[PDB]
Design a protein around this ligand. Structure first.
Ligand SMILES: CC(=O)N[C@@H]1[C@@H](O)[C@H](O)[C@@H](CO)O[C@@H]1O
Ligand SMILES: CC(=O)N[C@@H]1[C@@H](O)[C@H](O)[C@@H](CO)O[C@@H]1O
Ligand SMILES: CC(=O)N[C@@H]1[C@@H](O)[C@H](O)[C@@H](CO)O[C@@H]1O
Ligand SMILES: CC(=O)N[C@@H]1[C@@H](O)[C@H](O)[C@@H](CO)O[C@@H]1O
Ligand SMILES: CC(=O)N[C@@H]1[C@@H](O)[C@H](O)[C@@H](CO)O[C@@H]1O
Ligand SMILES: CC(=O)N[C@@H]1[C@@H](O)[C@H](O)[C@@H](CO)O[C@H]1O
Ligand SMILES: [Cl-]
Ligand SMILES: [Cl-]
Ligand SMILES: [Zn+2]
Ligand SMILES: [Zn+2]
Lengths: 173, 597, 597, 173
């Protein structure tokens, strides 16, 4: 039931990425291999078939797509979606300017840019609490209080690295 | 978390918010310049207002972090940049009024017109009206008329406004702990903390004045030759030991001697370098002009233009029905969105213009990955300097050959080369004493060194002494001749034109050296030389990131502006000059004027 | 009449007579060295006897003039040179015998042949037969053969004669109030009575060695680097710590590593700096070389060669039927009769030599202006340095390009630079230890410090210690390896080649300063520099009329020889050699032997 | 009658120069104008015509030719042949390598290299008396006594400045 994932009319914001569990099924993966539809198709495990899985959906910026690999400096890796060090399967990205961007600006896609400490692999931070770099409760418009969640702002006219990319991460156990 | 930790988090929040407002500001501003509708001027203001209001709000907040509590250039530099206080340091009314002045000076120079006393039904603007006269007219009096009219109508109008402008602007600079507004402007060249790479504001004057002495010999010879030539076009109007009548210099001010070429050309027999007609012969469209420019830049190992550039750029005027502003520009909108707006005609000048403009885009692209606040040329003199470089290599007879534009049989005899070099000097060398002089006055006016009652008296004294140029009609303090030039009455520092002019030759020489070029520096072509690109990209990728001194040392290998490469370029003309002037007077009398008395 | 008075007239007379005799001697000497006929060896002897006798007859008469009573220095030096006792200071038998030793040694050397163990009919002379083998074979055994045959045949022959030559030449030395023949030769460099410009005999040893210590690090690396390379050429014949085997160094003795270029070239995919192939390919001839080198001296301001030079010189081998001595020589016969004797081959070494030789001639012309007695190089080393100054400029890729031995498009980078500096090093730097070591042995022998039963033992000890070279087979005291060199068995001081190479770069550093030269010293070509020409000529025309110390100081600003210039000239290569050498031993053990097996 | 001076088979030594008197005669002079044969043609008078003379002949070496002119420093001008400071006509000279020089060596030509005082203009010293720098009659082979006439020695192979040159001096009155 993979088409129910790639081709889902809407995608999650990275910070609130979705995990869809797939078990008791058989897949060819041929539906994937052959396709210039995919800008990034990088596996971190193998390239065969066994007919047996987790599918993680979300949207990031072209330039962010690199952060969805083991290792990687961060911000999207650091605070949003972290892949594990060794352990892995595949990662699929693709350009969605025509769907997820407008000539006016599209700001529905959120990401988190502030947090006390990075995430653990596959951890998920859904909270939206005002932030101060030394703990302590916060009440904006105050100085040094900020909202940890930022809006992406995807426009047709931007460069490729600033265009929205629907990403799907496949995980194997 | 310390002050420095609280600063990074503050800056980060800025960059992200700035990207959006600024992107919106730019796209709106672009759509205007490309689609002049009343719905668009409404939008450009909309987005420009938010983005400006935001900056103010942010700077005022940024001032709540002391920058000498930070041992980290990168962040220290960002925080400092955001600390553009503005005229917000002044009171409510000294800010509204100043902006009133700023806007009125602007609108006067832009709408100012003068009318033919012999035919008052025809009133001419600067562009294209008066300007056309100043470029092409051979009639001393018509020329005299235009010149005087402009300074006599719009000049006198700007006089009072400019006076108050100077007081109001000075208070601001004082309140920001600068000596004067001049000192404020010199600020752009300043560097604090790095050792040897440091540069003070005053060191600029020093380095300008020292470097300018080494220019006089060349200029004096250029001057002497053109004086002789002009004597022929206006016999009896000009003295062979005197200054050059200010209104005979090729344009409204004599900022450039370019249009004197027709009557100063050394070897009038030799034909074109102009490939204007060679380009048409092959039905070349804009697509080819830029693809070529692009091919030029890829040749030195730099990247293709972005798909978005080809998709979103405006390469040709739509004419009427959707009209646009047609001045050639390179746009850096943000979000990796680069584009050029240029009403491409098919001339050689435009082919070359594309190479300048696309230099900018290449620069803008290189420094994209830098922090938002740090994306810009190393100083005000850098962007254009990179621009001119590209124009220089593209126009070499070697390069036009390579492209398949110059006839492969055309050889470089001693005459076509002096011809061209003179054309170069008429613009490049000609403009340097004028530019120095202009700021010299400006700077001194802001220090108080030149009193109101001697503004014009001191201007013309300096135009005579420094420039070799004289007023054809005398001017009391009812005038304000300097402000009759765009940059003055539109509040832009003018020294960038000098420092750049030298930078660009420093760049050239060092890039041509990197590129194993054999002959005179003026025939150079960095095309196909990747190691040049690398030497250039090394500073191109820096942006405003590291001090311009290091940025320069990256490409040239020296921490300062050196005039020596500039001379080198014009060395074969300088010799010719010294010999052509064998029996001509070289220098001028500050005492002789054309109205005399 | 006084004294200084009576002296002038005598000199004047000596002069006019000397010229006549000395010309007849040379024109004799020449016709022999270009046509070895029986009647010519006769004549060559005759005039040369009537000339030496004359000087002897005049030397005695010179002594009758109390020089330390004369206040004009011009005449005193002339008088002083004429006061020379020479070798007639020995007895009757001890003079005919010495002259017989000298002659026999000369003839054993020039007539030596080796014949193949596998061919009693094929015999090879040193030139060309053996020499070709040494310059070109890649065969360990062939080279071993040639090297050893030569020292076994000619070398052993010479041994007895050399021993008796030592004794007789020491006897003459001491009779002329000198420590030994070593000290005698060291005399050339001596200056008495000038203050701050004096120079003592024993001061030269001090200086050569002081200065040689500084050359060690550079030579050491060169050595290391060439050793590695020779290991690839001769797999398994060389220890990575051993001295280089003496039959592998490119010529018969390892005087020059020049012929090791093809197997040591740093970056062999680069366009060859050895323009030999270029020259052959363009079908250059002797005429073209010399006519080309003439053009070089004209370009700096010096005269052409004379009509006589072209008519009378021998620039090629006549072949068989008319046989000559091919040793390249620069002849100053007298009465403004200048020529070069050279069996020019179309190679790069000959191209360079042509310049050197013509260098000598140009020096000789320059001081033709002098009193007969003062018509010479400032010291034995000045002439050779002058030769090499030219050779320095002509060998630059810059200059090869200019003559068209290198493509006009040839582009200089750091790899071509290293290739060039390496090739220069192989010749220039690599001769230094060889030369220094050759002389020291001789010096020590003359001083008595070395006994007959240790003659070869100490040579080979010093070859190992100082030069890092080892005999491929062991040599008992039947051998006399030094005498296998032309200079040893033909009685010529060697240290000149050492001093020469210092003065060389000293001169060049000063000359390129004059030519307003930009970058590093190894990139300087003085061509077209009338300024540089002028400087050189100014010290050229002085002849022997000045102490070399002051003469040198007037060119370069130094009382003594200085190694700094040489070291600067090679620096880029030194720095590169150090890094190239990071994976190998730098230095050597004196204990490894190719025969201790 | 000029082609009897130049064109004369033989010429004398400088120290022993000859003078030919020329009166009652017409010479066109074109025999000298129309000639690249002459290496030196200096006139300290003019270069015109009146159809109206003394010709002095002698051989000197290349570099000695420059002394055959008013003023002039030494040895040939000093002890051999002196032209008067003002008073003058023309001085012609020409390279005679193939006539007065032999590849084996020609020593017939003499000059005086020692004299007890400079010559006045046009004087002629013919004596072969041994010279002493302080009075004193001489007898060789005694020291400080010299025979004052040296030979030139003109070989074919010398430089131009050492080659022989025939010279004829014309005087007018
Ligand atoms: C330690 C240092 O000097 N460099 C860092 C730099 O890596 C980083 O980009 C910046 C954060 O904005 O902080 C510092 O400047
Ligand atoms: C004027 C004077 O007394 N000096 C002369 C000098 O001119 C001459 O060349 C030299 C040769 O003997 O002797 C003296 O040095
Ligand atoms: C003046 C000079 O010293 N140079 C000449 C040059 O003029 C001449 O064209 C050439 C041909 O024979 O010979 C010499 O190089
Ligand atoms: C050594 C050198 O660079 N020679 C150049 C030569 O190449 C050039 O063509 C000539 C003409 O101006 O002048 C110079 O002598
Ligand atoms: C005999 C001698 O050496 N005299 C020379 C003389 O030839 C020369 O003209 C003069 C110029 O200064 O110097 C000397 O006096
Ligand atoms: C704290 C910070 O923002 N610094 C980053 C850091 O992520 C990176 O590892 C380092 C590379 O040296 O420099 C900056 O790009
Ligand atoms: Cl003005
Ligand atoms: Cl040996
Ligand atoms: Zn521009
Ligand atoms: Zn030599």
């Amino acid at each position: 039931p993979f088409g129910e994932v790639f081709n889902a009319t809407k995608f999650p914001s990275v910070y609130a990425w979705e995990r869809k569990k797939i078990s008791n099924c058989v897949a060819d993966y041929s539906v994937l291999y052959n396709s210039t539809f995919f800008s990034t198709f990088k596996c971190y495990g193998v390239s065969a078939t066994k007919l047996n899985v987790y599918a993680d959906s979300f949207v990031v910026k072209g330039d962010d797509v690199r952060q969805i690999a083991p290792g990687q400096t961060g911000v999207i890796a650091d605070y949003n979606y972290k892949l594990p060090d060794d352990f892995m399967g595949c990662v699929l990205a693709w350009n969605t300017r025509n769907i997820d961007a407008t000539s006016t600006g599209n700001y529905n896609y959120k990401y988190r840019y502030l947090r006390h400490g990075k995430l653990r692999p596959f951890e998920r931070d859904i909270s939206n609490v005002p932030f101060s770099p030394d703990g302590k409760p916060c009440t904006p418009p105050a100085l040094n209080c900020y909202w940890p969640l930022n809006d992406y702002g995807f426009y047709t006219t931007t460069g490729i690295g600033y265009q929205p990319y629907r990403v799907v991460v496949l995980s194997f156990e | 978390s310390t002050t420095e930790e609280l600063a990074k988090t503050f800056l980060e929040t800025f960059n992200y918010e700035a990207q959006e407002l600024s992107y919106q500001s730019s796209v709106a501003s672009w759509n205007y310049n490309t689609n002049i509708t009343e719905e668009n001027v409404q939008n450009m203001n909309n987005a420009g207002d938010k983005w400006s209001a935001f900056l103010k709000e942010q700077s005022t907040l940024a001032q709540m972090y002391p920058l000498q509590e930070i041992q980290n250039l990168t962040v220290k530099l960002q925080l400092q940049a955001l600390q553009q206080n503005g005229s917000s340091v002044l009171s409510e009314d000294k800010s509204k009024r100043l902006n009133t002045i700023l806007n009125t000076m602007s609108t006067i120079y832009s709408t100012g017109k003068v009318c033919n006393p012999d035919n008052p039904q025809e009133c001419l603007l600067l562009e294209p009206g008066l300007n056309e006269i100043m470029a092409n007219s051979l009639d001393y009096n018509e020329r005299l008329w235009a010149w005087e009219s402009w300074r006599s109508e719009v000049g006198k109008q700007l006089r009072p406004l400019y006076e108050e402008y100077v007081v109001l602007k000075n208070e601001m600079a004082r309140a920001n702990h600068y000596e004067d507004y001049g000192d404020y402007w010199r600020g752009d060249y300043e560097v604090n903390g790095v050792d040897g790479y440091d540069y003070s504001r005053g060191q600029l004057i020093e380095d300008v004045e020292h470097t300018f002495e080494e220019i006089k010999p060349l200029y004096e010879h250029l001057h002497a030759y053109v004086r002789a030539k002009l004597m022929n076009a206006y016999p009896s109007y000009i003295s062979p030991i005197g200054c050059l009548p200010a209104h005979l210099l090729g344009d409204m001010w004599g900022r450039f001697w370019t249009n004197l070429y027709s009557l100063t050309v050394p070897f009038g027999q030799k034909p074109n370098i102009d490939v204007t007609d060679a380009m048409v012969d092959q039905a070349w469209d804009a697509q080819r002009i830029f693809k070529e420019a692009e091919k030029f830049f890829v040749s030195v190992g730099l990247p293709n233009m972005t798909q978005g550039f080809w998709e979103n750029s405006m390469l040709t005027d739509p004419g009427n029905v959707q009209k646009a502003v047609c001045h050639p520009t390179a746009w850096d909108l943000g979000k990796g969105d680069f584009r050029i707006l240029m009403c491409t005609k098919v001339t050689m000048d435009d082919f070359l213009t594309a190479h300048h403009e696309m230099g900018h885009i290449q620069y803008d692209m290189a420094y994209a990955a830098q922090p938002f606040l740090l994306r810009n040329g190393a100083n005000e003199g850098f962007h254009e300097a990179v621009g001119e470089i590209m124009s220089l290599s593209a126009a070499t007879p070697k390069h036009l050959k390579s492209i398949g534009l110059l006839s492969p049989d055309f050889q470089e005899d001693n005459e076509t080369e002096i011809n061209f070099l003179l054309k170069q000097a008429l613009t490049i060398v000609g403009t340097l004493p004028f530019t120095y002089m202009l700021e010299k006055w400006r700077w001194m006016v802001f220090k108080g060194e030149i009193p109101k009652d001697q503004w014009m008296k001191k201007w013309w004294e300096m135009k005579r002494e420094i420039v070799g140029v004289v007023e054809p009609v005398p001017h009391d303090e009812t005038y304000c001749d300097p402000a009759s030039l765009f940059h003055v009455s539109n509040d832009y520092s003018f020294i960038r034109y000098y420092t750049r002019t030298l930078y660009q030759f420093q760049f050239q020489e060092a890039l041509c050296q990197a590129a194993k070029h054999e002959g005179p520096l003026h025939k150079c072509d960095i095309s196909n030389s990747t190691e040049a690109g690398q030497k250039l990209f090394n500073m191109l990728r820096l942006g405003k990131s590291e001090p311009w001194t290091l940025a320069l040392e990256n490409v040239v290998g020296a921490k300062n502006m050196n005039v020596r490469p500039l001379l080198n370029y014009f060395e074969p003309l300088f010799t010719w000059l010294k010999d052509q002037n064998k029996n001509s007077f070289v220098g001028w009398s500050t005492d002789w004027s054309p109205y005399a008395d």
